[PDB]
Design a protein around this ligand. Structure first.
Ligand code: HEM
Ligand SMILES: COc1cccc(OC)c1O
Length: 402
């Protein structure tokens, strides 16, 4: 596009380090715009992301690097009857009434277990010592991966993150860094080595684990879903479902530390934690630009005539800084009005795990502030955020008087 010639000089590294400056230009200049290094149109404003995600003239598509990472049928990348079946597969344990029966007994002992390892130290790095472990241990136990250690689940989602976001394409539209998928292939091979025996056992001996229910629920007598049919959704879980609740927790904490009067309010009044988290997700969206839709008919959007078959990446993290919608969106503010946000997406492909995720983050922050009410951020350690497809703080050093 002529007036966006400057986009040809945007780099993958620039977007990973801090996408907000480029996307501030995009929201003003071109809410729907082809980004050469990404090889795709991207939607950057709230109105366009919401329109594309809910439009009857669009359906899900996996991003190019997403397809190389997850293959088929990834729940995020399919539609029609397959999507309907995969949604019916994952939804039972995620139903709000079901989550409310057991979420507290799942997450709160886990949060306590990780807290007891450092709560008397006076210093911690909360991303690696608390947020990521609670997130992966909670989901891992729900899925049936009790025996897979939290360090391993963390390693897997980091490798899958890097593979899914290995998006750079060169002048010819080919992947610029094909070698960057090798780590994802290696993660998937390890995952298979660990998970295949569990599937073998669940096929014959179903139990209460969520993956056993993926094999068996809704199937005729003695039949199970083929493992090749469910594995891409297992991988999808082992990236975002494992990664995002820890990142949303951590970003919420960074935001509250940026507004010390608000941190104090939340510590004194934990009923404010859910509002704190919602603002945290808007302020640094954990799934920032990981998913996409493709047009099924010609459409006109934000002044652009798109042919049928055109992918559009949904940069929800940018939409959540839309200044048409928010005042001073780059500032964390607990008392912002409770406007809709797009950090869980929208439409038939919106997040299936919202209620579960919100409770995991809530219970983790409740127990953190009960154990360490006098938490303070270590201000010499700058909080670095990293990532374009998925974004969060790389570490969160904190201190407190023991
Ligand atoms: C704070 C944590 C989380 C955030 C911010 C988040 C956000 C998202 C987003 C942005 C998408 C894509 C939506 C779209 O393209 O419109 C998504 C999809 C999805 N998420 Fe969540 N997620 C979180 C945690 C979880 C967890 C813990 C689970 C599972 C227990 C989960 C299950 C899913 C599923 C199954 C999908 C695909 C839905 C589909 O394509 O039909 N999420 N999530
Ligand atoms: C691109 O990868 C993903 C996108 C959205 C949700 C995911 O996990 C639930 C996920 O793993």
């Amino acid at each position: 596009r002529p007036d966006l010639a400057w986009l040809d000089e945007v780099t993958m590294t620039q977007l990973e380090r801090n996408p907000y400056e480029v996307y501030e230009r995009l929201r003003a200049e071109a809410p729907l715009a082809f980004v050469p290094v990404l090889g795709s149109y991207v939607a950057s404003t709230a109105e366009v992301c919401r329109e594309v995600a809910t439009s009857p003239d669009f359906e899900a598509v996996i991003t190019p690097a997403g397809g190389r990472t997850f293959g088929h049928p990834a729940i995020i990348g399919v539609n029609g009857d397959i999507h309907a079946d995969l949604r019916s597969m994952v939804e039972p344990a995620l139903q709000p009434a079901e989550v409310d029966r057991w979420i507290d007994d799942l997450v709160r002992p886990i949060a306590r277990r990780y807290l007891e390892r450092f709560e008397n130290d006076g210093h911690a790095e909360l991303v690696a010592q608390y947020c990521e472990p609670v997130s992966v241990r909670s989901l891992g136990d729900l899925l049936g991966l009790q025996e897979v250690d939290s360090d391993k689940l963390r390693e897997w989602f980091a490798k899958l993150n890097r593979s899914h976001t290995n998006a750079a394409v060169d002048e010819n539209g080919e992947f610029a860094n094909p070698e960057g998928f090798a780590e994802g292939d290696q993660a998937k091979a390890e995952i298979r080595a660990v998970v295949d025996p569990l599937i073998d056992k669940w096929i014959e001996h179903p139990d209460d684990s969520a993956i056993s229910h993926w094999l068996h629920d809704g199937m005729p007598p003695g039949q199970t879903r083929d493992r090749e049919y469910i594995y891409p959704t297992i991988y999808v879980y082992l990236l975002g479902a494992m990664q995002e609740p820890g990142h949303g927790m951590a970003s919420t904490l960074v935001g509250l530390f940026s507004r010390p009067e608000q941190l104090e309010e939340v510590v004194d009044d934990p009923t404010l934690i859910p509002r704190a988290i919602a603002e945290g997700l808007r302020w640094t969206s954990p799934i920032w630009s990981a998913t996409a839709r493709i047009s099924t008919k010609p459409v006109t959007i934000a002044g652009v005539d798109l042919p049928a078959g055109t992918p559009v990446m949904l940069s929800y993290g940018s939409a959540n800084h839309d200044t048409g919608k928010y005042e001073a969106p780059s500032q964390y503010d607990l008392h912002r009005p409770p406007l809709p946000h797009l950090a869980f997406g929208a439409g038939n492909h919106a997040c299936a795990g919202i209620y579960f995720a919100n409770h995991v983050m809530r219970i983790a922050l409740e127990e953190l502030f009960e154990a360490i009410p006098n938490l303070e951020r270590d201000t010499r350690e700058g909080v670095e955020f990293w990532g374009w497809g998925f974004r969060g703080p790389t570490s969160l050093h904190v201190t407190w008087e023991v």
